[PDB]
Structure formats: C-alpha cells, structure tokens
Amino acid sequence: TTEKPTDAYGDLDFTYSGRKHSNFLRLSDRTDPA
Amino acid sequence: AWNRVDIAQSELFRGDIQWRSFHLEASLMDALLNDRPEFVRLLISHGLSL
Numbered sequence: 714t715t716e717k718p719t720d721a722y723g724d725l726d727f728t729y730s731g732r733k734h735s736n737f738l739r740l741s742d743r744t745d746p747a
Numbered sequence: 748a749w750n751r752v753d754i755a756q757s758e759l760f761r762g763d764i765q766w767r768s769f770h771l772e773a774s775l776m777d778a779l780l781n782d783r784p785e786f787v788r789l790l791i792s793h794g795l796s797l
Contacts, residue, residue, distance in 0.1 A: 729796050729797075
C-alpha cells in the first residue's frame with residue numbers, strides 16, 4: 714500500500730451549533746499508540 | 748399551551764419517543780409567541796439548532 718504523510722489534522726467544529734472546537738486527526742492503521 | 752412543564756418534562760422526554768426537529772420547532776414557536784421562559788429553556792436543551 715502506497716504510504717504517504719497525512720494532511721488532515723483538524724481544529725474541527727460544527728456549523729450553526731454551540732459545541733466547543735473538537736481536536737482532530739486522521740490516522741492510519743498499524744501505527745504506534747505511543 | 749397549558750404552561751405546565753412538570754407534565755411535559757416527565758412524560759414526553761423520557762426517551763420513548765424519538766422526536767424529530769420540526770416537531771420541536773413548531774412547539775418552540777408556540778412558546779415564543781406566548782410567554783413561557785421555562786419551555787424555551789427546556790426545548791433548546793434538547794439539541795436544537797437556531
């Protein structure tokens with residue numbers, strides 16, 4: 714499988730709602746939890 | 748319309764009925780035209796978007 718460094722690290726939040734911004738990261742499988 | 752929170756909170760939001768959005772929005776318009784602050788707080792508390 715063609716492996717590449719990611720791009721999706723997010724200060725994610727929701728439109729037209731009151732929730733605080735949610736921290737966010739897209740992550741591959743078989744990675745190290747440390 | 749009867750201005751009685753103690754019925755609606757304790758019989759209609761136990762979780763038996765999956766309420767949709769416009770079912771809440773029509774009741775919120777009835778609660779804004781009349782003067783019921785308690786129902787406004789109760790209906791916004793159930794995850795509605797303005």
